[PDB]
């Protein structure tokens, strides 16, 4: 999960208002050119590469009438309805996910409630307690980020294929200077922006801003 930034809203979601209208009658081709600008070409919840894409409502469309044509509630998930990860699993799968106890990528930095170890596991952050710990333990459970073998297996490979690359940059740290090494680290953190699991790598590179 990254910290998506919702800037503007598609114009198409203004001639449609909840109630009389239905989500089906919306031309989703006019929404994607805006979602792709916000979250890039990656899933909002797991940061995989969107190849089988669909539009998900953070709060479902059945338990929350209204908010169905509201821009704030629309994200892009990685499973089309022709799956066992975020999106499809958030509805078919997990059976109780009261929406308050979930991380909204575009309103809550999903780095205070998530830690991506170099083994590809998403464990709650360090030291969280109370309600802040339930948010992490629920977003890791309703958006499967530790219980899907095809995702946990695809993030171990992506986070460990660069582990030898990380160990060298930090190895050549006490020999180099602060400015040059920081520039090299930036260049290494400016290339994961266009790579899968942009945040799993960033946590293996510097930290979850701790």
């Amino acid at each position: 999960m990254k910290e998506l930034a919702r800037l503007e809203s598609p114009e198409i979601l203004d001639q449609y208002t909840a109630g009389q209208n239905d989500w089906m009658e919306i031309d989703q081709s006019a929404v994607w050119p805006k979602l792709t600008e916000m979250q890039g070409e990656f899933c909002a919840y797991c940061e995989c590469r969107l190849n089988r894409r669909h539009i998900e409502h953070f709060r479902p469309r059945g338990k929350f009438p209204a908010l169905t044509f509201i821009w704030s509630n629309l994200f892009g998930s990685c499973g089309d309805s022709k799956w066992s990860r975020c999106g499809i699993y958030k509805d078919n799968g997990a059976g109780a996910y009261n929406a308050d106890d979930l991380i909204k990528p575009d309103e809550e930095n999903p780095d205070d409630y998530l830690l991506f170890l170099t083994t590809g596991e998403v464990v709650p952050a360090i030291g969280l307690t109370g309600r802040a710990l339930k948010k992490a333990q629920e977003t890791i459970r309703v958006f499967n980020l530790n219980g899907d073998i095809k995702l946990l297996g695809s993030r171990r490979t992506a986070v460990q294929a660069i582990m030898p690359n990380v160990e060298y940059l930090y190895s050549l740290l006490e020999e180099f200077e602060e400015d040059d090494w920081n520039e090299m680290l930036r260049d290494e953190l400016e290339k994961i922006e266009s790579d899968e699991f942009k945040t799993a790598l960033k946590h293996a590179w510097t930290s979850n801003q701790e």
Partner: protein, 173 residues
């Protein structure tokens, strides 16, 4: 829905089967569990030996191992509306045709000794990065249960250095 040459649906016995097939032909072949009583270094050279002897005979082999899959192309796999996978199995490692085509983790999930390494990082990210007593008693148990040569110790000693330098730069700030 089948292919033309291979359709994989996910030594004495194999030789007897080959001899029987050759005798029948000289006078389609749907093998079941091609990897039956075959050491791993006879599974990655079985599909390539079943075509060399028989050039043109459609095969409907069914398998359970991730090794005979690494000698087959993606288009030939048929999971169970059967649907082909989303990775190229031909040439792929026999630890990702298992994870991403058969849903089986590399390390056992039920063995408490496999989690150790992935748990040892947590005891290092909690203490700001440096080692402590509760973490050093899990590093030793990794250096006494996996021997001092193995990848498990080579990854635990890579976490130690990376997180000791990741806390060094953080400290300078």
């Amino acid at each position: 829905k089948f292919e033309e040459d291979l359709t994989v649906i996910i030594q004495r016995v194999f030789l007897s089967l080959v001899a029987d097939l050759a005798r029948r032909m000289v006078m389609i072949v749907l093998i079941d569990e091609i990897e039956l009583h075959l050491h791993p270094k006879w599974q990655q050279e079985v599909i390539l030996n079943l075509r060399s002897v028989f050039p043109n005979i459609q095969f409907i082999i069914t398998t359970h191992s991730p090794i005979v899959l690494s000698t087959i192309e993606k288009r030939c796999i048929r999971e169970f509306f059967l649907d082909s996978p989303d990775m190229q199995t031909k040439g792929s490692e026999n630890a990702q045709i298992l994870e991403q085509v058969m849903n089986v983790h590399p390390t056992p999930p039920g063995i408490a000794e496999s989690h150790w390494l992935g748990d040892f990082e947590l005891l290092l990210l909690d203490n700001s990065g440096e080692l402590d007593n509760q973490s050093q008693e899990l590093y030793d148990k990794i250096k006494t249960h996996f021997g001092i040569d193995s990848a498990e110790l080579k990854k635990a000693d890579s976490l130690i250095r990376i997180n000791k330098m990741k806390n060094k730069i953080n400290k300078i700030r």
